[PDB]
Amino acid sequence: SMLDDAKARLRKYDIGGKYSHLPYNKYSVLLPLVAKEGKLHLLFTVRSEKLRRAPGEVCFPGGKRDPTDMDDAATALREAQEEVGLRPHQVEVVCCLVPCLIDTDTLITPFVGLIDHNFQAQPNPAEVKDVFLVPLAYFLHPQVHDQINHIFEYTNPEDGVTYQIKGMTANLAVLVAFIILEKKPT
Numbered sequence: 001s002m003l004d005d006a007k008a009r010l011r012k013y014d015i016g017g018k019y020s021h022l023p024y025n026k027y028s029v030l031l032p033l034v035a036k037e038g039k040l041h042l043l044f045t046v047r048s049e050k051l052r053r054a055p056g057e058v059c060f061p062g063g064k065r066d067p068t069d070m071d072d073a074a075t076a077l078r079e080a081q082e083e084v085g086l087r088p089h090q091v092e093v094v095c096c097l098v099p100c101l102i103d104t105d106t107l108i109t110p111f112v113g114l115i116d117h118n119f120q121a122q123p124n125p126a127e128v129k130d131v132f133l134v135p136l137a138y139f140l141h142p143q144v145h146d147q148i149n150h151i152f153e154y155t156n157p158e159d160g161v162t163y164q165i166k167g168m169t170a171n172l173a174v175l176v177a178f179i180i181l182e183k184k185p186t
């Protein structure tokens with residue numbers, strides 16, 4: 001099946017807890033996979049204008065680890081719940097992908113999660129301005145604009161709204177697309 005095939009692919013890239021105890025400032029993100037219309041999608045947030053860091057940017061749900069978190073996956077799930085109402089029974093964490101080093105003192109750990117088909121996002125407007133899906137296959141043939149660094153522009157065909165996706169968020173989306181979609185029979 002599509003979902004069993006995706007999970008099987010993802011597990012081959014799982015680094016697990018290998019880098020998780022290193023003494024960094026620690027953040028986790030959830031890369032949330034949603035199956036709709038017979039295809040996989042990633043769920044993204046647009047950060048609120050209220051926020052201090054990166055107002056109005058597209059990013060995955062996530063945030064800073066706190067003392068309550070049993071592990072880095074827990075960070076991702078707690079933050080996703082706060083941001084978009086995703087409850088833990090609604091997500092299966094499949095793997096931990098390569099962490100992202102930034103600012104010399106920070107390590108961001110990405111987890112891929114399969115999202116239940118009955119989840120409906122409840123954007124928390126103190127943190128999130130918008131929530132939207134992009135088909136995973138888009139990231140194989142993105143619409144690129146150079147700002148010099150590469151920016152993806154995705155237009156939602158449901159409503160014509162264009163979102164800009166860039167940086168770590170864009171990079172991780174392409175990684176997941178490669179992992180899941182490469183070398184597949186039609």
Ligand SMILES: O=C(Cc1cccc(O)c1)Nc1cccnc1
Binds near residue numbers: 058059060083108
């Ligand atoms: O803050 C995060 C996680 C994160 C950590 C590092 C980098 C990044 O792009 C994203 N996610 C969030 C926060 C508020 C609203 N929507 C998404």
